[model samples]
Target: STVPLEPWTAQQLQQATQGYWHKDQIPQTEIKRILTDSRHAESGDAFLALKGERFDAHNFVAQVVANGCQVAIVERPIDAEIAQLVVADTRLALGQLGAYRREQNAQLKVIALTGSSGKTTTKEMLGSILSRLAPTLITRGNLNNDLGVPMMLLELRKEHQYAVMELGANHQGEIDYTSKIVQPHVAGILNIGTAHFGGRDGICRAKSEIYRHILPQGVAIVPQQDDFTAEIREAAKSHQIMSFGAGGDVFATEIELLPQSANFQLHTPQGSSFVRLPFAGEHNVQNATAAVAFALALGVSLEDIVKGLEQAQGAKGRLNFIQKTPHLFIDDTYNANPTSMRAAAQVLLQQNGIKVMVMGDIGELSWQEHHDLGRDLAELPLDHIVAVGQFASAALEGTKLKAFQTQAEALPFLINLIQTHQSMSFLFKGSRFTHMETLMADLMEK
Candidate 1:
């Protein structure tokens, strides 16, 4: 990906960079690569020394130089001997550079979104629909943070006509800051729920982060039923806003569920709609609404968006149906927060077979927040609960779930139940430090 540039001299960089650099600047005709970790620095790569909690990238100046990195960007100035671009904050600069890069591509129609849940699903579905008409590029995996957003932007090329980026934040200013970089043509918030109880008074403020920039753009898509999410409409007062979910312009009605799959009749003011997903859950109705509303805004035909919904599979751990033979399995372990766990339980209630919730402890919750999450889980419907950690143990108590110290203890019982009844079963879980996925693996092996 390296391009040679002898014409772009140091003086030219000083001019282009708005006097940030003087004649001593090392500007190349083309940038070979951009990196943050000093350990991965190559000869021509520009290493960005980001200041973070776990590690201070500025501390590795010597190793970066030793690793053959010629150019480095840092917040603090190193020894008088070392050469590096001194900036106040490298992370902010990365966002600025990303915005600059986006500005250079005027033809790119960027669609950006955020929310407590369904951000990844909305992103994937929107990408799938947009690519039917234009060249689209989207964020992969958990690339929704400070370090990941800039890397996602750098991958944008001339061939990509549409860019979809997902933004997330723990605090107020974080999403607002990332939104400036994306400046999306369309922005949506699926739903807001109590997450990050340690900060921002729970879900309402978390929903606001996504709406800060998007609402003012006149293209804010919001969920009509969720009050926390509906608050986003007030933010977009000056812009053209649309709502989805139960009763929006692009919405779903007549939701139906089969044994393990769900079917829904979708409705838009423009016409009637119908779609089906091979997964069971009412929460999926909201996900489908977000996808349809977003696709409609992107000038896609309703038929195509509905078709995309019909063919699209849901997100990794958001109500995914894993195994269904001798014993049923729901591998919704990739993510877990209080709202999602309860939603999984709702899906379980719609099932006829024996229900077992094999839950790993939800991570990153403070002690007080754990009690709140415990109360939420106490309300779910399940036959037995195999709690893996102290938090899960606390949550599953008295919830029709038999709390086990670990999945290992619960496995033998599950196998026995399967053999005795010749019945089906369902497993609900979330990603935690505890490896509950291994428990499912062990069950399948037996």
Candidate 2:
């Protein structure tokens, strides 16, 4: 199943990475694969030694060489007698390698996007829509970071006609660093929100960096009503702009946001069609609208795009609904910020029967902000509340709520509630560290 790419010799690695080889005999060995973890190194794979905040891969160079690795890309000379490319930085070298691989497939048209909340959802929507017309490659899971971006690029093959990459950033210059490797034909800044520690301005500025390295005839897709619309437009001044949302180039009319599915009349330059997105929430409708705009830019037929939207299985752990006859579960446990937490709450409001909210801490919010959110959530129309984590009790202080510091503590109370309550369903919302999956598993198990 592991088919190798075209042979990349030691010399080509030096040329591509702009690094020099060290004292080892520059073997004629062909490196057709590359990996980050040394333990997973194959005989012909090159192990790239990346230095991180807590750990450094340079220490594992000896292990990879002994495990039959053909080449090692490192920042400094190591005692391992393997074909090594010593570069100034291994991370930069990895990006260069991805850029080289990208150029090799001249026909690959990349559509890059970034956002605070819906980047992954928007990417999944775009991938489902675009793949109907081309062999499209979407970033797998949350592999939108610096190292993850290059690794996704390396998976590109000649067969892939399009790549929809989600670029993520926590600090400045991260998008700038990944965008060079992406070199997209069309890019989108889905929306600007408080995702990272950076304030609103900082988040907008960091996300707007997606448009930095677009092609000459590139298109910029943006939200119509975002706080940073004007700023984003200024950043993409050279590229053709297409805005979407409540009012923009591609807009939705006669909208309906249901609990399980949504139906809306999608109005665009191409044509208008009654689009049924197999997911709930107005936020998801915006995500679908963005995808439709992206598909239209790439000249995908309206019919094909509609088909893709209907068949689109949304990203896991984001408003994923599972029915267990007696009750239903909304597994939005992937991650959360305030914006997304509220979005999930909006979806829960539309559900029928008794509603039970199982929520954990919202990361990136200050103590007062988390308590403010708890107060706000208390006002929501719900039958019961099961809050977990350190911030749980604080968040639900103003309302009739129950709190638990851990899932184990909350399990018995939750199990009894679900069994005894009549016509009850739940909405599970939490940050990644909250371990919402454990509670979900226990609920279904009971």
Candidate 3:
């Protein structure tokens, strides 16, 4: 058969990881699948033991052997009788193995992205564009970490023409380590802000890794209007740049924002095309422009780019509109960084109704941070701002408004706003830690 099987033999994997087998004889069988979880380990599959904060995969090696695992690639030798390839650290080996797999599929064009927000949404947009021509691999969920990035690479098939990967980090050198594995052909940073919490410099430093480690001759995607464009440009100085936003090589003009979507004219180096983007907000217009730049760099046509933009949908709880008779419910409950929270507020401000913002506390913010946010959100021309949680009052300190300690207490006022205003709109939002969605759910039920 001429089809790609993605088969990895013992000799190939040993050389790939530089790991040694227990005995002189290695299994002649090929590994078609890789399992990191012990529960999912099956016969003839290579089970790579990885360590997390809670559980160690090495402890489950004997259990996996019972499941007829063909090989065990781990940091240390276990008591199992199955073939074992010992390495220094299984986590690093995982990345090495992923790099090796990427090398096997040199035909694939990889694009890596990182940012304060919009990483997932933009990746989805790029996926939509690339899938029009050939198979495209996209990063799903929160799999933008050091471990998850490599795991994405291992799934690459020879027939895959493109891969769009998101790189996220909590510490320094996390992206640095992962970017080396991705070696993206077109690396992009959406926009840097206080994303998962840290100094702005650290945040910028980590995200800049996507551009710093771009593959040779690769095109670097930078926002022309971002706050740290100067720093981002320096990071990608060695690579060919494809900057996007207003006044950049690729940008959007004639943007018409809708209640839940937008229509825009996408301007790129290749050509210009009108995009009926399915996501709302001018911020999404920027997100769309970033995707367009990446797609253009890959030689995608203007027609297909527009087609992809039309079909693209934003990820969950991000400016999702639910119109229930008299009121329009804006659900952006999943994210609540200072920047994104302000963004959600701005999006809601565009509507035509008695606009009510039901906000919960942003996570891990001090009194000053929360108070500053209240001042900013208050500056927006909204009809009402209702808040709940510990720092809720601090967020609206100078507004002379009362904040409830719980959503239950906040509900009556929310219902009052709903019942009093015959025609109104509500935007419910909070951090992942705050279950603000529960309050929104109650309101939706009514």
Candidate 4:
């Protein structure tokens, strides 16, 4: 059980939240020891009965009473032994508490990042670089949603000099809610992609949610490679901004692409330097640049940045290089979007061997959009492209790719490709809906 770092009495908390307390008084000495995932009434833990789409927390109010939960933050009141803190909406109140934590703690430097892709990678890189200068706490994995944001914010403590948070959204207003709570002094927008097309004009407006939480004193780290992201930098004309890409404020020159790795000259206004990224794809380099620029802006020593980058490796599942034996197997199948698929293809093309792609259907896009995305993928420099699923078949136009109805159906064809023994570089990529990772398991057994 984790106790609040700066524990507040019930009176203090009510004053902070500006809410009328129905309970008599909160003890000054007794701090909230834990935040419960369940509504079970416990003495030390505060039960936050979160309401979800499929289920309501009200249904489990009885269970909370049985578990001896003395206090619970609820959306509605009922006859219960546990002390209830009734709010109009539990989720909104939880978010409010996160925002309130930041209001009280002005000493922490808050940083928030968001995008359609590369948000997680950029967060890891930024957090690693910032750690050289300060004690930083970053949100782990893909915990960037509405529920995750408040939970992450509440984790920040006085010991942390900086808090680097990743905010994600499939729709609009999500990032805005996160940013407002965090009030990040520095913010980075990773990359906007066609991940959510059903929403308002796809991902552009959704990416702008980062602006909702950005402070007037905040600095913007925008990517020059992305035209949409470039606009974010232009909008901050009066604010401190750093742009990075092929040839921008921060540019990569003398780029050398290798079969297994890459070498490039990383340049900034301060100076020009060389970097070697063992990771796959040019997109990873761009992700690296985002971190480098942020670190440099935050006064992290070049030596420290280089050290962190060298020690740093690619995130598992996302563009992970699973094996290096008789054949090269690039496990980019973790997740795929149009942008990531293109990036993966570019990396596979750079390899000195026959490239075969075992591609799967990307989900969450409209029917027509998926077909177009598949058409674009068919143009990649691959020896053979094996496609599966309804929209995935669209990549097989003009004999460029072979569409398979199922993974088992494609196995025999792939086995023959592997038999060629010509230093085969295989790229497995699709959305999680495709379960493309299972294909890698099959390949390893063979």
Candidate 5:
């Protein structure tokens, strides 16, 4: 039950969305909230009916209206008594409404970020850094897609000094569409990788769209290590570039990659500081450097940026560690790709004791690619491996990898090992569909 930070009357909202308005009769009732689901609709909330692949939200319009939703944004005219803002497409209307709503706070700094991996991590880091300077809003959870972008924007308030948004894309124009709504003042394009279905070049092109819609005289942050830096620089030619990596505008020199965290000397134009990042892995260091670069571009002090980086915790299920007596689980079960998979293995290499990897399907990759990934995992420094799902068996080939069709099938063997070992560390990595967290939960319960 979250109240709207910025209230809008129905007439004002209709007036704001001029072109999209079909036959909009403004209701006298004030729109207190915007809702997507019928169950969450309050008395004055505006229900937005979206068309999904499996189901059409238009069918639930009656339910939401009955539940006290005062307004509905729908594609078709309905016989319901509630005021309807009829539009050609509800999703596009939602985006437009968000863009209109964002314009209310002319001083608000919208910082946009896009990458194959680490976008969410960088977004969280940016939120931590920026909030020290002013009240900030960030993308909630993994809601970084087009639809999620609008939802994030709709929560903006005049008091909010900044909105740190993470933009994700599986297709070419998705970033462009979302970025136009964001129109960020400071943009960061984190390293591009193969997290999406598309190959290297496709993701590079998609990620570069973040710079295309940046506000005039705004800054663009691109990774120096990325192969597509030239293209990003070209795309963002109108704006100033703040490159970060091994040898860029903001670079990390003296590095110590500890098991649980990292200590590095972060060098920026403002000055250099020894940053104690409370997160593991070198990949996170890169994420931190990008955050530092963006924070500097926005005139955030190096001291505050260091404090923010130290205060920031890695996103849940992204290399998060849980120590339960004899077992330590690296819960990286959010999602997976070739780059992340290797990075997780590298993290596991730093730990002591009998190291085990519980891996599942790496989605969107070809079968041959998965097969090669399996061979790559065999070369890692691990005592044993539990491979689950269809392509997971590829990793276990001719090595200490045990194959299981599902996590349920692999449970007994894992439980037995847990009982036998006094001290052991297990790394769980998989895509969302594989449900690796379910297995982690069962182990914790035992």
Candidate 6:
């Protein structure tokens, strides 16, 4: 549904992957896309046999050949009668091919981004703005991991004028190698959980790895209001740094938060304009500001940037307003970090009627984190606070707080709350591992 890929010939394929073609004569058929699974391989396809921990893809080489694939890329050449590109490692070769294809389009302006939270939101905003001016490539889904990043890069086309790559890392050095391959012209980090940065020092350093090998004249985007801005700046110090926050180079003023939208004056180094963002909450306001910062770094004019911010859509399950008739339903079941959880609460506060927050335990948190978050929610003026899942017991510190060991046990309370009130504003959050959205979806059907 997006841009078409540039065809891969024998010479370019071998050069990009740094692999030798097993056949004496290079096959002239050409490859349009690289298929990973043999089960889905069709005629005239180029299949890449990737290896994982338990399974070796080389075993499926014959299967793909039987399935009508004419060529295969693998670590070891199979005896099958097909053109084979032999590489030291297929995984690494994929990255090489992606890097090669990215460079082929010299007109592409690569914008790489990473953060603990709000990375997807900012990326969407950037994609919305940049694509309006020219043919832009946006990272689809959660394709921000090591392997995922390269796969996305492989989608690059000659006509793509800009690329917004979202880099994700839970460990050190993941983004370092990926960013090096990307060689982005503009790189940015949203925030390292600025609200609570004490225990995630390791994560902070790992997230900042996006700037380790930026292009020679690349620009680095820093969060000016972050709890550890200095550390992020240190990694990006070699590049031209542009900060974004309440008082940074890019900022938002005269803010107005609507039920499902936001209006703010967006200020950038180039110029200032008003933006009517379709996404709500203060966290999103900050996310919009970060996008503006990246846009400014990429030399995007204020006129184009404002229109982009105005049309930018939120990622799935992120402050999604499900319904607005008798009651307001907000589903933020995508993530459950402390900062995001609080941001969801802030959105719920802006709603009227019987305000209720039905959240689940964030499995990544410690016992104290659950207690503190549960206690905090209890202190809020919401009418009902329901917690579920394995860690639900620890979060029962609030006087209004109620905990259920599992979603099944909590269903009765959710059903009763929905039926009891005619016009209530209900917020369903946290559900990453707990599938808390099931309860909300089940109620939605009724």
TM-score for each predicted model, relative to the true structure: 0.82, 0.93, 0.87, 0.83, 0.93, 0.92
Give the better candidate number (5 or 6) by TM-score. 5
Better of 1 and 2 by TM-score: 2
Task: Tell me how many clashing residue pairs each candidate has.
Answer: 3, 0, 0, 4, 1, 0
Question: Which regions of candidate 2 fall more than 4 Å away from where they truly are?
Answer: 1-7, 195-198
Tens digits of per-residue lDDT for model 6 on 28-77?
A: 88887786878977666688888888998888888887878888888986
What stretches of model 1 exceed 4 Å from their correct place? Answer: 1-29, 76-83, 195-206, 209-218, 228-230, 324-327, 349-354, 363-383, 392-402, 406-424, 442-446
Candidate 4 lDDT by residue in tens digits, 245-286: 866677777777776566788887777678877766666677
- The regions of model 4 sitting more than 4 angstroms off are 1-36, 39-43, 52-54, 65-69, 170-173, 191-217, 229-231, 352-354, 366-381, 399-402, 408-424
Candidate order, TM-score descending:
5, 2, 6, 3, 4, 1
TM-score of 5: 0.93
Deviation in Å, model 2, residue 408 alpha carbon: 0.9
Can you write out model 1's per-residue Cα lDDT over 105-172, one digit (the tens) per residue? Answer: 77887777887777887787777777777778788788788767866776676778988899876665
Cα RMSD (Å) between model 4 and the true structure? 3.9
Q: What is the C-alpha lDDT of each candidate?
A: 0.68, 0.83, 0.84, 0.71, 0.83, 0.83
TM-score comparison, 4 vs 5, better candidate: 5
Cα lDDT of model 2 by residue, 1-446, tens digit: 14435567787788888888787557686877888987798688888888889999888887887787868888988876687788998888888988898888899888889887778888888888878787888898878888889888888888889999999885689998998888998897888765445678888888788888988887888888898888888998878888888779888888887779999999888888998899888888888888888878877888888999998888888889988876788898888787677777778888877788888887756667667777787788777778888887687666357888888898898887866766777889888988697788888896
At residue 397, candidate 6 shows an lDDT of: 55
Backbone clash tally (model 1): 3
* Model 5 stretches with alpha carbons more than 4 Å out: 1-4, 19-25, 52-54, 195-199, 366-371
